């Protein structure tokens, strides 16, 4: 029987071994067959009917598209600090600019509020206004 679009997805992903920045897996679990991975979320198909599955919610096909060609939002962590003497390690959200995430922020004296964190920032010291 000729493949439906899903199916056809699917098929040319498991070939090729990935979509974009995630990647094909294939293997069969009790969520379905885990589909493709990136970070910490995994999208799975149970089938009789083909269904998309992430974070324990069906999800339509024209969905899953859209979802899986979104940005990933990746993590640093930093250190900030109120007063160059009391540190506090901090999730940073890649996707986010210093200024949206923490307010003014100076990276050893350049205001780095309207940057996005890059690898480089890991464990580096950020200084903020008191929440
Ligand atoms: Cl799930
Ligand atoms: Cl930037």
Same mark, same amino acid.
């Given at each position: 029987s000729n493949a439906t679009p899903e199916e056809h997805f699917i098929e040319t992903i498991?070939?090729?071994?990935?979509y974009k920045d995630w990647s094909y897996s294939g293997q069969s679990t009790q969520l379905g067959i885990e589909f493709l991975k990136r970070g910490d979320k995994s999208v799975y198909y149970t089938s009789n009917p083909t269904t998309?599955?992430?974070d324990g919610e069906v999800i339509t096909? +024209?969905?899953? =598209?859209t979802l899986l060609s979104l940005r990933?939002?990746?993590t640093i962590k930093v250190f900030t600090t109120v007063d160059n003497?009391?540190?506090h390690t901090q999730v940073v959200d890649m996707?986010?600019?210093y200024?949206?995430?923490?307010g003014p922020t100076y990276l050893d004296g350049? +205001?780095?509020? =309207?940057?996005?964190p890059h690898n480089s920032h890991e464990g580096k010291t950020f200084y903020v206004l008191p929440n």
């Open positions: 498991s070939l090729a071994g990935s998309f599955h992430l096909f +024209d969905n899953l =598209k990933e939002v990746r003497i009391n540190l996707s986010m600019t200024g949206q995430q923490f350049a +205001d780095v509020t =309207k940057i996005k």
